Amino acid sequence: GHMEHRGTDIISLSQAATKIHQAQQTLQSTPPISEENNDERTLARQQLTSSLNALAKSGVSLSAEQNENLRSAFSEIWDMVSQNISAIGDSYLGVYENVVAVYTDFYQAFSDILSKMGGWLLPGKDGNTVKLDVTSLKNDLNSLVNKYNQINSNTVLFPAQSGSGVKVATEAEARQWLSELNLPNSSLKSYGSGYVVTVDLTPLQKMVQDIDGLGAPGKDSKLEMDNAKYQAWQSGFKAQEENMKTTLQTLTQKYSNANSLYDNLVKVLSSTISSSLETAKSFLQ
Numbered sequence: 275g276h277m278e279h280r281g282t283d284i285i286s287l288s289q290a291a292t293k294i295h296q297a298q299q300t301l302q303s304t305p306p307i308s309e310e311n312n313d314e315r316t317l318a319r320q321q322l323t324s325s326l327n328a329l330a331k332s333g334v335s336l337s338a339e340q341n342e343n344l345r346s347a348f349s350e351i352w353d354m355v356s357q358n359i360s361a362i363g364d365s366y367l368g369v370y371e372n373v374v375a376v377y378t379d380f381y382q383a384f385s386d387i388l389s390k391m392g393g394w395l396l397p398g399k400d401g402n403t404v405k406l407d408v409t410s411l412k413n414d415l416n417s418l419v420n421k422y423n424q425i426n427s428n429t430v431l432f433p434a435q436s437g438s439g440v441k442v443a444t445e446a447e448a449r450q451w452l453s454e455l456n457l458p459n460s461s462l463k464s465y466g467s468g469y470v471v472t473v474d475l476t477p478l479q480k481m482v483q484d485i486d487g488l489g490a491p492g493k494d495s496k497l498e499m500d501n502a503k504y505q506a507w508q509s510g511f512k513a514q515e516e517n518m519k520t521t522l523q524t525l526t527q528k529y530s531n532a533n534s535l536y537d538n539l540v541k542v543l544s545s546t547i548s549s550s551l552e553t554a555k556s557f558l559q
């Protein structure tokens with residue numbers, strides 16, 4: 275117990291610092307907006323846990339102070355830290371990444387429909403009226419609804435999906451995420467032996483109702499409307515667009531904060547490792 279080994283300690287601690295810093299760079303720079311990006315972020319967390327696994331076996335000793343920091347931050351020591359952080363990565367941050375990537379593609383599908391609206395607004399019989407192609411707009415929104423009302427990897431926010439299954443959760447676990455995500459009750463769905471949480475279609479479904487609200491189209495499938503009525507319909511349609519945008523914004527902020535919670539634990543690892551490196555390089559005179 276009397277043989278020091280500064281050299282080995284320096285190598286071990288420097289190796290762990292480098293792998294931690296590398297995983298942290300990926301997790302700070304890679305947006306959770308695609309399956310490919312999320313695979314890179316998942317791999318970064320695997321590299322980080324593996325580095326704590328090697329560090330645990332290295333025989334670097336910690337001060338009581340570092341021991342305490344680790345205990346308080348993450349509630350033999352390194353294995354406890356590694357299990358705790360791994361669990362936060364898999365069960366919390368990993369779910370949020372999936373929520374964003376799924377919502378991102380869904381929102382892009384909605385944006386693509388919005389990009390067609392210009393073409394569905396035509397001149398009216400005079401300068402006080404317009405013609406709205408209510409039929410083509412309703413059909414596109416209904417197609418979106420039909421697509422994202424299904425249960426598959428285009429639609430499921432929780433659990434994260436992979437391979438052949440539909441992976442499902444208990445009603446209790448799914449309700450907890452429904453609440454965590456601040457999504458409407460309609461986003462909780464049963465599938466086979468359990469439950470899933472899906473994208474919110476309610477604003478789209480409200481858009482389609484407000485369109486039928488305008489009245490039956492004419493023979494051409496379009497709807498002639500006075501300027502005031504069109505402006506009033508347009509303002510209601512924009513309000514629903516804003517509901518979708520607000521839901522997405524809540525979700526991406528919540529992701530960022532789950533990413534920040536994981537990063538704050540990474541900062542604790544890095545400071546602890548830096549302190550130990552200093553100890554290994556310091557000679558008390």
Ligand code: NI
Nearest residue numbers: 275276277278
């Ligand atoms: Ni000894």
